[model samples]
Target: STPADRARLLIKKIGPKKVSLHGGDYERWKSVSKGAIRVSTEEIDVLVKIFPNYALWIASGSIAPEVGQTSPDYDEANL
Candidate 1:
């Protein structure tokens, strides 16, 4: 199997939802050429592991619950 196919199988074995993004947005991202390529990127890989929480917060349209200080609310779009 190809690297992408192998990686996908291992990811499934691990069964980590954090490594997967739910809903139509992820499907949309995967349908593009940029998304189909598996470039070696350390930072990018890290983001994949945090994608679930990332998408969960964004669906709420804010990150208020994740903050611990009194300040301006964060905007998910700009971050």
Candidate 2:
């Protein structure tokens, strides 16, 4: 998937509550990725803020489907 595709999926996965729970700006994420909006570093940064551990997974190319494993607990040390 493309960067925009990744961001869209993450936004939907995290949803409004999780985004707010993670201190992310959901409105900006929505506006940025809405419709055919082009992907940008800024939007990805939002994903980083919302899902830090999954950053590498979100930015990189396709990997094994099993790589979808994600922890609900945030790693403060990594942040």
Would you list the clashing residue pairs of candidate 2?
none
Worst lDDT 10-window in candidate 1: 68-77
Clash pairs of candidate 1?
Answer: none
Best by TM-score: 2
TM-score of 1: 0.23
Model 1 stretches astray by more than 4 angstroms: 17-79
Q: Local error of candidate 1 at 5, Å?
A: 0.6
User: Cα deviation in Å at residue 48, candidate 2?
Assistant: 1.0
Residue 40, model 2: lDDT of 72
